Design a protein around this nucleic acid. Structure first.
Ligand SMILES: Nc1ncnc2c1ncn2[C@@H]1O[C@H](CSCC[C@H](N)C(=O)O)[C@@H](O)[C@H]1O
Length: 327
DNA sequence: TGGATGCGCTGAC
DNA sequence: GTCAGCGCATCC
């Protein structure tokens, strides 16, 4: 994550729904905002959240009476994506994990915050012939909010990962916000190799499979894209090896394959998956952030998370818009 | 709401 | 056909 000199969100309160690791919390607090509520029902996610923020998020949001949620200015929610991801079955709203957005609408209707800041996977934007995004847009509009949505790729914001996500920023109409803008992309000067840990700390992650098939030559020049160098097995998810001179592939939460959830990388002549701390870095988390003691759970958590840097630029712009109140 | 890994249907070229 | 994917199915 980056340093934020001008705290655009100072004095503003926000809630952290579907909190996970608390990526939205890190981003908004870095801008000066204050978290007044968090909700996350996964046991291990609650543990790591508490480990880092000192509080246990409330459980199952579907059983929480929205009237009990503290007043706030910004509602944050990176809601479930299994039902909308290009990697899944795409059952969408028909999926038992795909109707959480309506719980969000339920809370917004009651708490009417100034801003609703949501995140989901890129496929959410085109899912069901664009009908899914349209539903969210119309729902927010009905709730009397403006709707700004755009897909941003983390590689355009200083983080070496091709993580494409749709970000939806909604302003309550009475605020008459007409100058919100998504952050502009800038040149990437950090690559996977810049975030790796010393070899001595990741030897246990080295995988030497006799069915490894190097398909492309390593590159010496850094490039802002994923560069596949080979595969193992049939080359499915988690069976692909990439160059560290390029950027990382999207981290996943339930990913399989031998290089599960992180993908494989060629490092000093060897092939290995990423260490939880390297996943944290590829997600923009500071080294000060404490990872969950279970590596399996940590990979899952980071795979479900958000790139802090991206949310920071967006949060800054949300604040920039709210603070522009000329006479 | 365990940990591990082989696997494909689909979206976007 | 090329490849990627906050995933899925199934094993212990
Ligand atoms: N009914 C429910 N109540 C509370 N949390 C839920 C939920 N259904 C799913 N979740 C949680 O929703 C999260 C979605 S992934 C969001 C991660 C978050 N942005 C962070 O930065 O890491 C998961 O952690 C999941 O456990």
């Amino acid at each position: 994550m980056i340093e934020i000199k001008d705290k655009q969100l100072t004095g503003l309160r926000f809630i952290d729904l579907f909190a996970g690791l608390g990526g939205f919390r890190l981003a908004l607090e870095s801008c000066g905002a204050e978290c007044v509520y968090s909700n996350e029902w996964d046991k291990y996610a609650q543990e790591v959240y508490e480990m880092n923020f000192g509080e246990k998020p409330e459980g199952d949001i579907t059983q929480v009476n929205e009237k009990t949620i503290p007043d706030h200015d910004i509602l944050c929610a990176g809601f479930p994506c299994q039902a909308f991801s290009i990697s899944g079955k795409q059952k969408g709203f028909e999926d038992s994990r795909g109707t959480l957005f309506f719980d969000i609408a339920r809370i917004v209707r009651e708490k009417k915050p100034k801003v609703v800041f949501m995140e989901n996977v890129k496929n959410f934007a085109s899912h069901d012939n664009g009908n899914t995004l349209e539903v969210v847009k119309n729902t927010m509009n009905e709730l009397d909010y403006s709707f700004h949505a755009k897909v941003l790729n983390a590689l355009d914001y200083g983080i070496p990962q091709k993580r494409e996500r749709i970000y939806m920023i909604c302003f309550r109409n009475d605020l008459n916000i007409q100058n919100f803008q998504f952050p502009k992309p800038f040149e990437l000067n950090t690559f996977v190799k810049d975030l790796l840990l010393p070899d001595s700390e990741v030897e246990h992650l080295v995988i030497d499979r006799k069915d490894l098939v190097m398909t492309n030559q390593e590159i010496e020049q850094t490039t802002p894209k994923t560069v596949r160098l080979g595969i193992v097995g049939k080359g499915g998810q988690g069976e692909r090896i990439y160059s560290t001179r390029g950027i990382a592939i999207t981290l996943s939460a339930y990913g399989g394959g031998i290089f599960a959830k992180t993908g494989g990388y060629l490092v000093n002549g060897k092939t290995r998956k990423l260490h939880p701390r390297e996943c944290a870095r590829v997600m923009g988390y500071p080294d000060s952030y404490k990872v969950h003691p279970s590596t399996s759970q940590a990979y899952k958590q980071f795979g479900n998370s958000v790139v802090i840097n991206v949310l920071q630029y967006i949060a800054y712009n949300i604040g920039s818009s709210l603070n522009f109140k000329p006479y």
